[PDB]
Design an enzyme around this catalytic site. Structure first.
Site, PDB file in Angstrom:
ATOM      1  N   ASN A   1       2.213  -5.312  -2.876  1.00  0.00           N
ATOM      2  CA  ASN A   1       0.794  -5.705  -2.685  1.00  0.00           C
ATOM      3  C   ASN A   1      -0.022  -4.409  -2.444  1.00  0.00           C
ATOM      4  OD1 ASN A   1      -1.141  -7.878  -2.092  1.00  0.00           O
ATOM      5  ND2 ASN A   1      -1.158  -7.102   0.014  1.00  0.00           N
TER       6      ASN A   1
ATOM      7  N   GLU B   1       0.825  -1.235   0.000  1.00  0.00           N
ATOM      8  CA  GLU B   1       0.000   0.000   0.000  1.00  0.00           C
ATOM      9  C   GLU B   1       0.852   1.275   0.000  1.00  0.00           C
ATOM     10  OE1 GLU B   1      -2.956  -0.387   3.091  1.00  0.00           O
ATOM     11  OE2 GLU B   1      -3.609  -2.377   2.328  1.00  0.00           O
TER      12      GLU B   1
ATOM     13  N   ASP C   1     -12.085 -10.812  -0.907  1.00  0.00           N
ATOM     14  CA  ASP C   1     -13.352 -10.931  -0.191  1.00  0.00           C
ATOM     15  C   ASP C   1     -14.360 -10.137  -1.042  1.00  0.00           C
ATOM     16  OD1 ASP C   1     -12.497  -8.432   0.894  1.00  0.00           O
ATOM     17  OD2 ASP C   1     -12.005  -9.321   2.828  1.00  0.00           O
TER      18      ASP C   1
ATOM     19  N   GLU D   1      -5.899 -11.075  -1.038  1.00  0.00           N
ATOM     20  CA  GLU D   1      -6.783 -10.850   0.117  1.00  0.00           C
ATOM     21  C   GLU D   1      -8.247 -10.800  -0.273  1.00  0.00           C
ATOM     22  OE1 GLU D   1      -5.395  -7.388   2.322  1.00  0.00           O
ATOM     23  OE2 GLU D   1      -3.277  -7.950   1.936  1.00  0.00           O
TER      24      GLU D   1
ATOM     25  N   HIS E   1     -10.158  -6.733  -2.546  1.00  0.00           N
ATOM     26  CA  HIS E   1     -11.238  -6.414  -1.625  1.00  0.00           C
ATOM     27  C   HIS E   1     -12.307  -5.737  -2.429  1.00  0.00           C
ATOM     28  CE1 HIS E   1      -9.004  -7.627   1.837  1.00  0.00           C
ATOM     29  NE2 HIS E   1      -8.030  -6.766   1.594  1.00  0.00           N
TER      30      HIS E   1
END
Length: 326
Positions: free
Chosen positions: A176, A135, A243, A241, A212
């Site tokens: 990432n 990030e 979801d 990650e 995400h």
């Protein structure tokens, strides 16, 4: 013809990994047994959700605590899963010994090199993929003004990757980030960043797309094109990650069906690109997810419900994997 057909078995056939993020102290949860059983049955790669971050592993300047990370690594090794380390350099949840004093560039570079070499050498050969910087880019597509950036400038990112490769030459090193799955200002900034690092011989081996996302899905054509541009820089691709969050109010069956269609489509596109090496979800049961605390009004974003029963998205992804093999 074994009686159950798991996700990890299908992933092994497609030479990819499919896995999850492990909640802190999973081994001491009231339902530890069930949690660990569903995890070992289904998955073949594990990322510790938090217990390799700075606040847990490096809680004071000269103190390191590897004890909880080693519990994650032990569970993975016992159950033939690889480990994805997360994360060596990030702007959030830093300890007070970092956030509570003013730093100069030379001093903070030395702190970061010591953290990275200590942690990466501790797990040398046992952690196959590291999220080296997480990030670093803002939501306008400039560098994020973190402690690292403000104090060091942009060279912190190339130094983190160089120091990590020195401490473990066999680990796959990735950058990432979130909301870079499509072509947009943020992913364009990350693309040029990485293109420039690799021109300088910095060892960025891959890119992590956090994934995400929500019930609106993605612009699938843009994600397909963005995966192609990154792969053509010579990168391995990890969906790190995943979801798919749904509103908690109303029409649950409708949103569980849209979640299944979205997971199916993401898997279709990823399995069509051989640079994609692994797909992980940020957790696996809705009982244990970061989504309801972080995205107010949303949740139910994972593969299994609160009672560990598979959701429509689980069957949808299984069907896609089985068709890809056959």
């Amino acid at each position: 013809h074994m009686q159950n057909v798991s996700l990890r078995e299908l992933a092994e056939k497609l030479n990819i990994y499919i896995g999850f993020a492990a909640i802190n102290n999973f081994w001491s949860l009231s339902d530890e047994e069930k949690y660990m059983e569903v995890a070992r049955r289904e998955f073949n790669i594990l990322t510790p959700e938090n217990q390799m971050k700075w606040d847990t592993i490096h809680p004071e300047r000269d103190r390191y605590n590897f004890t909880p990370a080693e519990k994650h690594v032990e569970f993975a090794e016992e159950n033939n899963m690889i480990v994805h380390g997360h994360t060596l350099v990030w702007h959030n949840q830093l300890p007070g010994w970092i956030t509570g004093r003013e730093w100069t560039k030379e001093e903070l570079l030395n702190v970061l090199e010591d953290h990275i070499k200590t942690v990466v050498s501790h797990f040398k050969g046992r952690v196959k993929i590291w999220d080296v910087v997480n990030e670093a880019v803002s939501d306008s597509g400039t560098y994020r003004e973190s402690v690292w950036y403000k104090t060091i400038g942009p060279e912190y990112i190339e130094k983190a990757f160089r120091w990590t490769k020195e401490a473990d030459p066999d680990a796959i090193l990735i950058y990432n980030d979130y909301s870079i799955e499509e072509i947009n200002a943020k992913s364009n900034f990350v693309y040029n960043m990485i293109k420039e690092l690799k021109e300088k011989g910095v060892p960025v081996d891959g890119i992590g797309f956090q994934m995400h996302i929500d019930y609106r899905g993605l612009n699938y054509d843009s994600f397909r094109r963005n995966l192609e541009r990154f792969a053509k820089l010579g990168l391995q691709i990890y969906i790190t990650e995943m979801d798919v969050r749904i509103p908690l109010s109303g029409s649950e069956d409708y949103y569980l069906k849209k979640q299944a269609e979205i997971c199916a489509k993401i898997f279709d596109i990823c399995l069509d690109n051989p640079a994609v090496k692994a797909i992980q979800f940020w957790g696996f049961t809705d009982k244990y997810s970061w989504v309801p605390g972080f995205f107010k009004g949303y949740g139910k974003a994972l593969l299994f419900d609160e009672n560990y029963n598979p959701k429509p998205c689980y069957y949808a992804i299984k069907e896609v994997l089985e068709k890809k093999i056959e």
